[PDB]
Design a protein around this ligand. Sequence first.
Ligand SMILES: *[C@@H]1O[C@H](CO)[C@@H](O[C@@H]2O[C@H](CO)[C@@H](O[C@@H]3O[C@H](CO)[C@@H](O)[C@H](O)[C@@H]3O)[C@H](O)[C@H]2NC(C)=O)[C@H](O)[C@H]1NC(C)=O
Ligand SMILES: O=c1ccn([C@@H]2O[C@H](COP(=O)(O)OP(=O)(O)O)[C@@H](O)[C@H]2O)c(=O)[nH]1
Ligand SMILES: *[C@@H]1O[C@H](CO)[C@@H](O)[C@H](O)[C@H]1NC(C)=O
Lengths: 580, 566
Amino acid sequence: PERGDLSCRMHTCFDVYRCGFNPKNKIKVYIYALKKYVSNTISREYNELLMAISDSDYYTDDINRACLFVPSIDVLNQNTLRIKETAQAMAQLSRWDRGTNHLLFNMLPGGPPDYNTALDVPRDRALLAGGGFSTWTYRQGYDVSIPVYSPLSAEVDLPEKGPGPRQYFLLSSQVGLHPEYREDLEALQVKHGESVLVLDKCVRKRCHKHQVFDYPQVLQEATFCVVLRGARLGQAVLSDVLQAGCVPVVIADSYILPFSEVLDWKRASVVVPEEKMSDVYSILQSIPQRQIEEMQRQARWFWEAYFQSIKAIALATLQIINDRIYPYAAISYEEWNDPPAVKWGSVSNPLFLPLIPPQSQGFTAIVLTYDRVESLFRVITEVSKVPSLSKLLVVWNNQNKNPPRVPLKVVRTAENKLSNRFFPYDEIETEAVLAIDDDIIMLTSDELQFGYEVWREFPDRLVGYPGRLHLWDHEMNKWKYESEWTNEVSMVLTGAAFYHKYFNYLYTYKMPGDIKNWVDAHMNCEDIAMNFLVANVTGKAVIKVTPRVERSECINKFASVFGTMPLKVVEHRADPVLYK
Amino acid sequence: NSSIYKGKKCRMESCFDFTLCKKNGFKVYVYPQQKGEKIAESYQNILAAIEGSRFYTSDPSQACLFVLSLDTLDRDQLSPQYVHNLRSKVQSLHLWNNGRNHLIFNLYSGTWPDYTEDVGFDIGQAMLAKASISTENFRPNFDVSIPLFSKDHPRTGGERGFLKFNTIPPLRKYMLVFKGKRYLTGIGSDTRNALYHVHNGEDVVLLTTCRCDRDNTEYEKYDYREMLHNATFCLVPRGRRLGSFRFLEALQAACVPVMLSNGWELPFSEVINWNQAAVIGDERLLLQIPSTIRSIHQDKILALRQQTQFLWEAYFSSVEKIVLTTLEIIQDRIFKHISRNSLIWNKHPGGLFVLPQYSSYLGDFPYYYANLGLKPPSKFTAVIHVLKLLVAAAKSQYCAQIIMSSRFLPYDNIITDAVLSLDEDTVLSTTEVDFAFTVWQSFPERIVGYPARSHFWDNSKERWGYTSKWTNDYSMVLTGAAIYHKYYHYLYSHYLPASLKNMVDQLANCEDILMNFLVSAVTKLPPIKVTQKKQFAQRQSCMNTFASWFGYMPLIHSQMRLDPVL
Ligand SMILES: *[C@@H]1O[C@H](CO)[C@@H](O[C@@H]2O[C@H](CO)[C@@H](O[C@@H]3O[C@H](CO)[C@@H](O)[C@H](O)[C@@H]3O)[C@H](O)[C@H]2NC(C)=O)[C@H](O)[C@H]1NC(C)=O
Ligand SMILES: O=c1ccn([C@@H]2O[C@H](COP(=O)(O)OP(=O)(O)O)[C@@H](O)[C@H]2O)c(=O)[nH]1
Ligand SMILES: *[C@@H]1O[C@H](CO)[C@@H](O)[C@H](O)[C@H]1NC(C)=O
């Protein structure tokens, strides 16, 4: 090899012809068979790495259909490696032309006396998943920054208490490293020597001047944890400090944090230059408590998902490389950086662009009916006089009876069910859809136009006239249904409602559980499923426009199938500016 | 010592003096414009944008960054915009200091042979705000990548996004449309040149121009705008330079760009996630490119479309936005605890309107309450700029504290994230305050208030006018009886230039109008008027000045009020 081409990138050195467009959009990670290489014995961590890669769906036993490659030479810590004859083994590997696709996992790079930052073994081209990365010796977008796995992650299991007040604010738990670091730490501890806790020794234990501290339990007690670097930028104290819910304070300059390409380390750790020891405490004083607890949660979940076992490290690294090689099918930021607790509660509105459509396209009016010929005729006659009625089609749900200024398209519905009103018909040329029913002969075209106008301001919300409410019966331990005049609104029945055409696609292509088929097997409760779906997907409330099978059972069924109550309670209705 | 780590290996820890960058915060010094020097219109726009920013400093001593006054944008010898003897004319300057803390904008570095990274003059230890920079020559966390724009690109403001009629399915008439050129017999254009294997005379029309007669005959059939608006995806491939004008044109028409420029750092790639807004593809898989865009799900296409529009209107619509984004990127490099998260830049409203010096915690801004699973604050601080009004404000369950531009300062005495503004004779009852606060909890980004006014286009004079008359709609809610997030106070204090605030103080009016302009620029939504209620030339001049400084009209008309149910 040639020491590792620091100019290598994913477009000039990475080979992508052999890794095409597999429909699942998943890479193949072939592992070389174990060899003696008379090489040091394979450590337990590297065995865990190999087993984790093999057991995941990334693995592939076909050498000629492999996207990524991984050798069997444990190079996690080269301090116990010859840094010679291992390059011979790497070049000996089959399909190693120049190591174009091979991936090397390293935990502690460098050695005596310079202590380089990236795998001093000659590599030439090589995907380097390594710790202790420096800004200069880090091929951005090509190499992966992985942590140093500490055995305390598996050997020691500690309580996962939630973020909150802790005994000591700032803490330094590393025995020694370049005395001057200790000197500035003790200078910090001289003045405000109550919060700052400087400790040393006297693998599993640490010590103070006289007190002995168990490791890594002492971390859990101090909210902030002063991580230094010493000999190498990457230290295995980072796992340890993550498992305890301690916000890292890195003081390794030009240190690429592990998984910094996809993870948002700015909301989980604090980076301090090595020339600000005297006032790093003031720096930590700047951060408020809320951000402190958010960073503690982010650190804890970073540990649980990425810093807990070599399996997590391997999965994260392979997923990062998959995201890089398949940007179109790459996992989103939220999946990378959100713990499940907040991932459940967080809402990603599909229609997030705050557009306002013009007053020219008009709405759509999907009318559904089975036998209401007179009421249907009255409804169609009244709706046919609103200027914005871009088109008005009919849905004839009956099978026995047959059909007797805008396209009055009719489509004979094959089968009878409520869900026919929510299909994404190609005949809808607009985005606004008006779901109207036969019993709504009480609506004038003026209010239909005003409802379309209000929908134009919120093209991703539910804008309707019939206001309905849900409440909670603690005595019955169930939700109820209110249709009487009440001070709050959480639903709008689809008997008269403007909604985005995308909600039809939502209803009849993506529904939680079996709600659609369950509700069409029944005869009612369809005007609650749409509201549930909208409130779940958008995380927003409803606009009621102007004063106008038990349904509580289906409200409770919807709440149970969702797992929470998506519907939001509001006390505001949209009126006109020139109203009365 | 960092002597070895200089030049191509320059980073912020070896080629940037942090002592100059004090707490004042990222001051930028522009050199004086020496007479008899070539200077392009684009560089005039860039320099003027720097002058009109809050980072400008006339004193080189009180600076922490330096930008040359010479036309370094076009470094092509064959270009008429080229400036000769540039290296001598920068080495003559004594403030050059080997380029330490110097930013060098550039758009067309290189000449006809290979259009390399060669900028001509020695830069020393200076950061490059280069466009169409390759990853091999890039210096992460040190250099910035910027968009390649044209001379006719707006200096300020920018045209709004062309994407209207968000139809389902999001796919439009054609899928893949490309119209362009095939640079013959040279370096570059090795993709555009081979955009005929995929061509099928269908939704994959890759019509090129200069066999060439058939290409020319098929090229002169459609219209470039007609195919940019009737499309799903628009290729942005590599030519002579890694970047092209088509990137911003496809980012404006919402036509989801499919990158085919291997090894190009997309503009502001340090802070912008481009997997959200575009499809990045290797030019070595061009034959597979159509199938991939076939396999993209409809919801992903919708998200890409909306994110494309967001990014366009946030960081690319004007040259001023580009320059400000470069400045913000370089500024966040200084204090790693006062930088911006990867979420701030990548969603609404954007990194230009969100300042980390106020806070680095997403929960301190009103723009992320849904992405964090959190809720808007339940308490509001009341600010009054009277006894009965104070009593009415106090008789509420959400009033935690009670306290011309002095009413928009970043007061540290305010604890809550919501502020209710009051005047001397605002008759605001307790029920009204509670309802307004609840509506604001429903709409935290916007302004929620009772007094409203509108703006009209005076076609007789070709200007903007201020109408307080009761009309069929409104576009502005006065910030004198309204509830809004307190972050806008800081934004008012730290985003608007000194000139606008100075004139607003001198004429002792137009503070609510300016606040509405700012919040409409941020949210791109009309304000929220609550309840019926609804109890000169200076204002018109203020509207015209604000429209000039913003470069557009951010105000949006609304016809719907918000009233209590029943
Ligand atoms: C919108 O709908 C989705 C899907 O229905 C909701 O996500 C679901 O949220 C619940 C709780 O919010 C999750 O339940 C949790 O399950 C785990 C075990 O998996 C359990 O340990 C927890 O204690 C909790 O019960 C559920 O997993 C999650 N996903 C699904 C598929 O149900 C989301 O909460 C809804 N959002 C709103 C605002 O309504
Ligand atoms: O039919 C066409 C061809 C080109 N252009 C313009 O030409 C520029 C990019 O095309 P070209 O290939 O000539 O330039 P390059 O992308 O190679 O810099 C942009 O400003 C386009 O708007 C255009 O408007 N219509
Ligand atoms: C799309 O094509 C139609 C003709 O089919 C044309 O009239 C229109 O101008 C094109 N562009 C659009 C709709 O943006």
